[PDB]
Amino acid sequence: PGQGIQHKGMGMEVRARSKAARKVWDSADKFTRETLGFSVLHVVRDNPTSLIASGVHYHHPDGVLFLTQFTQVAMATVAAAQVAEMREQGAFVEGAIACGHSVGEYTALACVSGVYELEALLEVVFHRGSKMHDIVPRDELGRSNYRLAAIRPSQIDLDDADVKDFVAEISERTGEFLEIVNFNLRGSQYAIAGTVAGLEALEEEIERRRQITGGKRSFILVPGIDVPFHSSVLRVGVADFRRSLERVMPRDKDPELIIGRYIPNLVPRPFTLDRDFIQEIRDLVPAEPLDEVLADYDTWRNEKPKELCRKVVIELLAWQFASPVRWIETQDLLFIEEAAGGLGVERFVEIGVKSAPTVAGLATNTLKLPEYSHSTVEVLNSERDAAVLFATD
Amino acid sequence: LISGLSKIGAERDIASRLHVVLPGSPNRGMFGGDGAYGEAKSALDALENRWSAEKSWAERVSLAHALIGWTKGTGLMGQNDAIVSAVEEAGVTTYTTDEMAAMLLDLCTVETKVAAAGAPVKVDLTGGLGDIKIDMAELAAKARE
Amino acid sequence: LISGLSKIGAERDIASRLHVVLPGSPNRGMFGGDGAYGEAKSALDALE
Amino acid sequence: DDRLAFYKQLYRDHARFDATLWVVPANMASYSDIDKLVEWVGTEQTESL
């Protein structure tokens, strides 16, 4: 799962019991204390207000745990520790296909494929948080001319193509900026960022289009997000983060654990290293390291493949900043791959403790509407369903 | 008090070094007339050892040692005020409160702050009262008398 | 204790000098491992 | 208040921009005071209405 459901003392019960959880937390907490002069344990355990770090000063009236430079770190460590325990009990299956939503994708790769050290994971994730704060213009009050909004196309007869249409029209019409940021659920969840007036005009449209609306149905504005990220406005700051990734993500890694198991955001379809796949990336995200590899695929000599996967993996993570996260396609893709590979019993488990109910509830409603085919499916959450995860009952 | 602010700094997790200026008494052992300052503040050298011993105190607290020389206040030293000129005749310096305050701030400058972060800084703010050959058995008592 | 035996000596009026051997710890500051002796006994110079 | 008025006099003279002064009753002889004071010095910076 992604950010925003994080709670004070999340997964702190597991830390007191599991040994694997302690090693994940303490190795992470020690590094942060020595390098950046602060502890993630304290932040998670009791939520502070202001914090001063090495070069930076973070102040929030509510909590620092809800600040992204921290929140992402907390969320990543919580999940990484929970999976480690699941791995210690051997409950992790050898053929498990894994994916993540936004910041959760970094944890996904960390847990299943071990693509970075525990301290290495919290480096990228922390810096990615600090990178998300300085990207967009602000006022004296820290105001934004933009915002984000959550759409539900349902309750009326409207489709994904109908939503895309209406948004594209009002985007061109007013001359303002309106972008569909997140494709989450087929007929259920969509996120949209751009000019506030554009968000308002779009809110207005469905209220007019839907015949039954007296209450401004189907539209939820997002508090706290001032950045129209995952739109066409963010593509500038990738190159600096693309280098930062290559520093913290070296070339000795497991290709297979990622391939076919991992579903990027920028790329809705499963990771595989092929001339076909690398091209799909370039099309969505034009890039210098990628376009050359596509130009000559005749580099076939066996020294390449791992080195190829290592850059392709980083390209997906670096430009994940820019490209919209497709959760719809991620879910639907799983159906596509199963159907071609057989439909027999599947178990869907979400990890990260209290973040687990979200994308499961996202899956649950998705398992309903397109998936009506009557399949045996199990939706399991680390927070809620733990008795089922460890099979103890 | 040092331990208390060390806990807060560690619990709330700051790497910021609290600079504690230790109000050391000037030049212990070469004055017999103070009766209070000279003896009490000599264990500050032993306190600098505690920080040099305890490992985790470095990030929370830095020890800046300042020896505060002869400094003229009205209330306590109202007897000592007249012989301030007399002691100053030995080629030694007695300080006004504003002068000594300035000496204490200079330890709080960025240059000397970083110096304290690398290692404990012992500063002599005394006016040369250390090599003083003036007999305190007389020139202090008589002054007080 | 020193003051106590000083009173007795003065009250009962003896000029006899009580020799108090002060159990000083060896060479303060050049050992960091004792942890007790080295620091405590350096004030015996102040007691002198 | 005679001590309280003095620090007000001292502040209104020597205060620059960005300058904030805090005056409190305190006793360094009390361990309770020390613990209570820094527990006050270290907590939030927040005012709940």
Automatic annotation (TrEMBL), chain D:
Belongs to the enoyl-CoA hydratase/isomerase family. It comes from the Bacteria. It comes from Mycolicibacterium smegmatis (strain ATCC 700084 / mc(2)155). Transmembrane segments: none annotated. This is Fatty acid synthase.
